[PDB]
Amino acid sequence: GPWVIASIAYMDPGNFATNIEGGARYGYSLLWVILAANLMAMVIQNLSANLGIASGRNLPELIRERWPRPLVWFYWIQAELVAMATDLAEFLGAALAIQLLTGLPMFWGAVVTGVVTFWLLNLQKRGTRPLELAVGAFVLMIGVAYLVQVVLARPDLAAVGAGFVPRLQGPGSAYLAVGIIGATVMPHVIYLHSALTQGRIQTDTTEEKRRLVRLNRVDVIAAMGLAGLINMSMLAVAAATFHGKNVENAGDLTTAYQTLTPLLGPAASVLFAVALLASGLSSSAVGTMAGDVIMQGFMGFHIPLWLRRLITMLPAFIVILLGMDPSSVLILSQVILCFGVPFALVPLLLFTARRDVMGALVTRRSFTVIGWVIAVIIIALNGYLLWELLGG
Ligand SMILES: CCCCCCCC/C=C/CCCCCCCC(=O)OC[C@H](O)CO
Ligand SMILES: CCCCCCCC/C=C\CCCCCCCC(=O)OC[C@H](O)CO
Ligand SMILES: CCCCCCCC/C=C\CCCCCCCC(=O)OC[C@H](O)CO
Ligand SMILES: CCCCCCCC/C=C\CCCCCCCC(=O)OC[C@H](O)CO
Ligand SMILES: CCCCCCCC/C=C\CCCCCCCC(=O)OC[C@H](O)CO
Ligand SMILES: CCCCCCCC/C=C\CCCCCCCC(=O)OC[C@H](O)CO
Ligand SMILES: CCCCCCCC/C=C\CCCCCCCC(=O)OC[C@H](O)CO
Ligand SMILES: CCCCCCCC/C=C\CCCCCCCC(=O)OC[C@H](O)CO
Ligand SMILES: [Cl-]
Ligand SMILES: [Mn+2]
């Protein structure tokens, strides 16, 4: 199973930005958002995985083959904007880590990131599998560090428990809450996960399809459960480190290493930036591969990979030339990603409730309703954010 490197999206630089900023600025009051977004992601990623197993096709393929041509065109275009926002936080997050490790300007950090992403693009599994394992080592261990630091930091349990009750903290809190949902419920994974499980069967029977669904549901929840524990711990450690005090540039990724200083000591700066670098490079490489697959499913053709790697790279250089804050752009991209979630959910909820698509593996009616409740929740939360951002 070499497809495990796609699991870095739940630990991409977007999660680092939203977790650290959420704790530093709003303390523990956003823990419930991470728990909600992680539970929503378990349901959605199971439906996506069950769609590929039951139907044998990925979600963009089904839209292309079943829905009218103009609707398929609109769905491919909005899927490309999702890939732009997704790759932006991951590519810029890698460039930021280059600056944290070498002091190199953000422009040259992106130049280095570009050459590296172009090099990984045309590599086979022989030279990539050791890199995938090395990335998984840094990110897992930096996640274990937060799981250990969240206990050693002695957090205020009264504020931690209160943080699991849904509450907003002004206008900027809904903005960051929407960003936390997009950082966990990622639209590009909704399309991609259906493609990772398609064509993965051996005897093409119902009993075998039910077997792959059972194994997937246990594997998804086990990994998603660990990712949620890490994300909550990272926000809790960030809250216990910065919130309530007045630390300069609190929440920014250039100072986030201080969250692990009591545990790692003088090594907290390098190990954080190394984990952020491996996270950004692998997610940006997987994201480029995923966008090529999503376009092929929607349109029947695709642009060459070097051209896609080039187009998705321009906004990162534009943002750097604009002098914008990298951590603030990482959050904004996650916010934009959450506005693409309802578009991905509607065909997922419809297709997995169809017998001519799923066969005997039609989704249970209870989980179809929970999915539509999740979709309505995210549509309502995206609308309230757009309401305050436009005024009133
Ligand atoms: C991140 C969330 C994004 C939310 C906003 C979504 C993207 C907005 C722009 C859409 C392009 C216009 C959509 C229409 C697609 C082209 C016009 C069309 O209808 O297709 C042409 C023809 O009918 C088929 O062959
Ligand atoms: C087992 C390996 C252990 C390696 C542990 C160290 C890792 C250093 C990270 C990148 C190398 C580039 C660092 C050189 C860049 C010079 C600019 C700079 O980082 O300045 C900071 C300091 O004042 C002067 O290094
Ligand atoms: C394709 C691989 C990249 C090729 C590089 C391989 C190694 C050369 C390293 C440094 C020199 C790079 C050129 C440095 C010249 C910069 C002059 C300048 O004006 O800097 C402005 C800055 O680029 C904002 O526009
Ligand atoms: C403190 C709990 C409230 C925080 C709310 C955020 C959610 C965090 C989720 C799981 C905690 C991680 C626990 C992982 C256990 C590893 C830590 C540990 O074992 O602590 C050893 C230490 O030496 C003993 O003194
Ligand atoms: C089961 C999975 C294990 C994973 C580990 C998850 C860590 C969660 C630990 C603490 C969260 C909330 C505990 C706080 C209990 C309620 C808050 C409190 O301390 O009481 C204050 C009172 O409610 C106000 O007046
Ligand atoms: C803004 C819209 C995107 C801009 C449009 C592209 C801009 C040109 C960029 C690089 C040169 C093309 C990449 C060079 C690789 C050529 C690939 C190719 O055709 O292969 C021929 C030959 O084998 C090669 O070695
Ligand atoms: C077919 C045509 C393509 C369809 C296009 C659909 C529109 C793009 C959708 C979401 C992007 C939202 C981006 C919001 C930009 C906010 C920028 C910002 O807030 O930053 C301040 C500004 O950059 C000062 O530097
Ligand atoms: C706050 C809202 C979130 C609530 C969180 C509740 C926890 C549910 C999470 C995972 C269970 C599995 C989800 C759906 C798994 C597939 C269900 C199904 O019907 O699949 C049967 C068929 O065999 C295959 O196609
Ligand atoms: Cl708090
Ligand atoms: Mn993510």
Ligand SMILES: [Mn+2]
């Ligand atoms: Mn900054």
